C-alpha cells in the first residue's frame, strides 16, 4: 500500500539521520577517549618504573605476587557498555569471557564474576551464572574514582583467601580506530619477570605493600579507558 | 542446637504428616478424574451409537 510505504520511507529517512548523527558523535568520542588514554599513559609508565625499582629492592613476599596453594576460584572482571548500539563490541567481550571460563573450568577453577557495564550485566542475568558485584554508570566516561573502587573490590576478594586464587580482566584493547579485539589479562597473581641490567623511605617492603594496590588500580583504569575508546 | 535439632525433627514429622495428607488428597482426585473420564467415555460411545 502506498500509504504504508510512504510511512516506512519517512521512518527510515528519520533513522538514517539519527544513525548518521551518532556515527559522527562516535567519531568525536574516539578522539576524546584517545586523548584521555594518552593523558593517563605517562602515569602508568612511571608507576611501572617505580614498581620495578621497589620490586628490585623488595623480598617479593607480597600476596599479589604468589600463586595460591589451592586454585579454589578465579575472579573475572568483564568490561562492557551501558549505552547500546555498539554492534559486536559486547558480543566479542562476552565471547572472550566464555572462552576464558571454558579454560578456567578446564584447569579446575570456577570463575566468579565482577561486571562493568549494563549489557554484560543483562547477559549474565539471562545465563544463570551469578555476578558477585557490578558497576554500570560510567563505561563511556570512566573516571579514576570508579577504577579505584573496582580495584579495591578485586584485591579485597584476592586477599580474603569467600575469596579467589587468581583474578583476570576481559575487555577490548583499542589498537587502532580500524582494529580492536577483546583480550583477557590475568591481573593477579602477577608474574615476576627477571631481566638484565635508589634510597627508599621508610623501607622498600612498606612502599611495595602500599604501591601494588595502586598499580592494580592504574591497570584497571587503563583497561576501562581502552574499553571506552573501543566502545566508541 | 537443641532448638535447631528439635525444629529439624518437628519439620520432618510435619512434612511426612501433611505429605500423607497431600498423597491421600491426590489419590482421591485421581480416582475422581478416572471416574469423570469414564463418564466422558460413556457419552462418546453414546454419540457414536
Amino acid at each position: 500500500t502506498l500509504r504504508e510505504l510512504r510511512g516506512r520511507i519517512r521512518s527510515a529517512g528519520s533513522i538514517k539521520k539519527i544513525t548518521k548523527a551518532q556515527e559522527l558523535i562516535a567519531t568525536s568520542r574516539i578522539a576524546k577517549a584517545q586523548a584521555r588514554v594518552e593523558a593517563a599513559r605517562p602515569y602508568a609508565a612511571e608507576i611501572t618504573n617505580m614498581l620495578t625499582e621497589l620490586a628490585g629492592a623488595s623480598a617479593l613476599d607480597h600476596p599479589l605476587l604468589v600463586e595460591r596453594k589451592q586454585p579454589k576460584r578465579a575472579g573475572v572482571l568483564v568490561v562492557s557498555s551501558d549505552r547500546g548500539l555498539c554492534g559486536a563490541y559486547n558480543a566479542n567481550v562476552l565471547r572472550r569471557a566464555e572462552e576464558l571460563f571454558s579454560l578456567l573450568r578446564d584447569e579446575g577453577k570456577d570463575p566468579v564474576l565482577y561486571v562493568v557495564g549494563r549489557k554484560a550485566l543483562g547477559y549474565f542475568s539471562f545465563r544463570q551464572r551469578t555476578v558477585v558485584e557490578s558497576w554500570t554508570g560510567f563505561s563511556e566516561r570512566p573516571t579514576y574514582e570508579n577504577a579505584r573502587e573496582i580495584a579495591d573490590t578485586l584485591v579485597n576478594a584476592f586477599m580474603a583467601g569467600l575469596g579467589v586464587d587468581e583474578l583476570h580482566i576481559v575487555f577490548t584493547e583499542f589498537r587502532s580506530m580500524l582494529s580492536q579485539t577483546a583480550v583477557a589479562r590475568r591481573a593477579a597473581p602477577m608474574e615476576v619477570e627477571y631481566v638484565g641490567e635508589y634510597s627508599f623511605e621508610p623501607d622498600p617492603e612498606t612502599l611495595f605493600d602500599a604501591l601494588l594496590p595502586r598499580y592494580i588500580a592504574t591497570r584497571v583504569y587503563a583497561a576501562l579507558l581502552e574499553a571506552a575508546a573501543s566502545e566508541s | 542446637l537443641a532448638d535447631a535439632d528439635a525444629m529439624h525433627a518437628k519439620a520432618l514429622a510435619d512434612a511426612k504428616a501433611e505429605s500423607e495428607k497431600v498423597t491421600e488428597e491426590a489419590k482421591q482426585d485421581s480416582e475422581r478424574i478416572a471416574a469423570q473420564l469414564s463418564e466422558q467415555a460413556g457419552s462418546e460411545a453414546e454419540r457414536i451409537k
Binding site: 620495578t52 591481573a187 608474574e191 615476576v192 | -
Partner: protein
C-alpha cells in the same frame, strides 16, 4: 489468532451472561493495551514496576486465550477460565505452564467442586459465596500444581635470578 486491537464486538456486554460481564468486562482493552505496550517496550532495557506488572499479566492472558480446535468450553467453564486471568490468580504461574494450569484446574473444579459450575449455569452470576469458594479452590490447587520451577602481567626486577 484474534488480533485483539482491531477485532471488536459493538454489542459488547449485552451479548454476555452477567458472570462473564463481571470477569471479562474490559478484557479487550486490557489485551490491546498489552499489545501496544509489548510493541513499545520490546526494546526498552528496563521497565517501571507497573509496566512490568502489565507486560507480565498480558502474557498470562494471551496464554490463557490460546485454545486447541474441537475443544469447546461450556460458558460455565469459560467464566472460570477468564476469572483466573483477570483477578491475577495466574500472576504467580510461569507463562509457559499457564495452559496446563487452566486445563488441570478446570478438570479439578469439575471433579470436586461441580457446585461452582452448576451455580454459574443456573443463576448466570458469580455470587460472592461462589467467588469466595472458587478463590479457595484456586489457592488449594496452586499448592498441588507441579510447575516447571594468557599474557601475564610482570613486575620486572633489574637483578639476575637465584640458582
Amino acid at each position: 489468532a484474534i488480533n485483539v486491537g482491531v477485532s471488536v464486538s459493538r454489542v459488547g456486554g449485552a451479548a454476555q451472561i452477567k458472570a462473564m460481564k463481571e470477569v471479562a468486562g474490559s478484557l479487550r482493552l486490557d489485551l490491546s493495551q498489552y499489545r501496544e505496550l509489548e510493541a513499545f517496550a520490546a526494546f526498552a532495557s528496563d521497565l517501571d514496576a507497573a509496566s512490568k506488572a502489565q507486560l507480565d499479566r498480558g502474557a498470562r492472558l494471551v496464554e490463557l486465550l490460546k485454545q486447541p480446535q474441537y475443544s469447546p468450553l461450556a460458558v460455565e467453564e469459560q467464566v472460570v477460565a477468564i476469572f483466573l486471568g483477570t483477578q491475577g490468580h495466574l500472576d504467580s504461574v510461569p507463562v509457559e505452564d499457564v495452559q496446563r494450569f487452566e486445563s488441570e484446574l478446570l478438570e479439578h473444579v469439575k471433579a470436586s467442586h461441580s457446585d461452582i459450575f452448576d451455580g454459574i449455569r443456573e443463576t448466570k452470576k458469580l455470587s460472592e459465596e461462589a467467588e469466595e469458594k472458587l478463590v479457595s479452590v484456586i489457592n488449594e490447587f496452586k499448592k498441588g500444581f507441579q510447575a516447571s520451577d594468557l599474557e601475564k602481567e610482570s613486575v620486572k626486577v633489574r637483578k639476575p635470578a637465584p640458582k
